[PDB]
Amino acid sequence: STWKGPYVAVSLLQEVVALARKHPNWWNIGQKAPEVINTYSRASVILPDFIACRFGVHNGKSFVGMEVQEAMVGHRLGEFAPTKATV
RNA sequence: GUGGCAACACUAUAAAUCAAAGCAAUUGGCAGCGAUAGAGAUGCGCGGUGGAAUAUGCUGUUUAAAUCGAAUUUACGCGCAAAAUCUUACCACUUUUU
């Protein structure tokens, strides 16, 4: 999907710009960004940078809080919001 | 009561109940009763299943919901000649009108 426009994260970006009132990524490298970020859609992709952000993702029953680290940068956020069919 | 060596052989009614117990020709269901016809109907062949994996449907388990019916033949590639949201009726949350 890299061809002809590779990234979709608009509502996540609206919340990210809400976080970006003093620093998007600790420009003031990262300090965990204690204000929680709670998205309402997991179809979003993940953009480079975006590190140390507390993302709360919807599972259809709740919001799942997961801290992003360096490995999950080229992913789509719905991969981290399962339906918990453990057994 | 008569006969006998007897087993019993007679003769011999009833008390009491029931509303039918019966009979003959049928018309249908059986055959563990035969003769004539028809079906890969077999024994005659070929290729499958059941062995492996995938697809796909169903039960059962769990999950918040795994929406609901189809249930032995004739249910299980079934309603679905198509579910990424919508289709969608089920759940979590937030609202709406009686």
Question: How much β-strand is present in the residues?
Answer: 5-15%
Question: Could you give the order of strands across the largest sheet?
Answer: 1-2-3
Can you count the helices?
Answer: 1
- What structural class results from the helix and strand content? alpha+beta
H/E topology pattern: HEEE
Radius of gyration: 13 Å
Cα end-to-end separation: 34 Å
How would you portray this structure in words?
This is part of a larger assembly, with one chain. With 87 residues, the chain is of the alpha+beta class. It has one helix and three strands, in the order αβββ. It has one helix at residues 10-19, and strands at 37-38, 54-58, 63-67. A three-stranded mixed sheet has the order 1-2-3, covered by helices on one side. A hairpin with a 4-residue loop joins β2 and β3. The longest helix has 10 residues, at 10-19. The termini are far apart. The chain binds one RNA strand of 98 nucleotides through loops. GO terms for molecular function: rRNA binding; structural constituent of ribosome. Belongs to the universal ribosomal protein uS19 family. This is Small ribosomal subunit protein uS19c. Keywords: Ribonucleoprotein, Ribosomal protein, RNA-binding, rRNA-binding. It comes from Chlamydomonas reinhardtii.
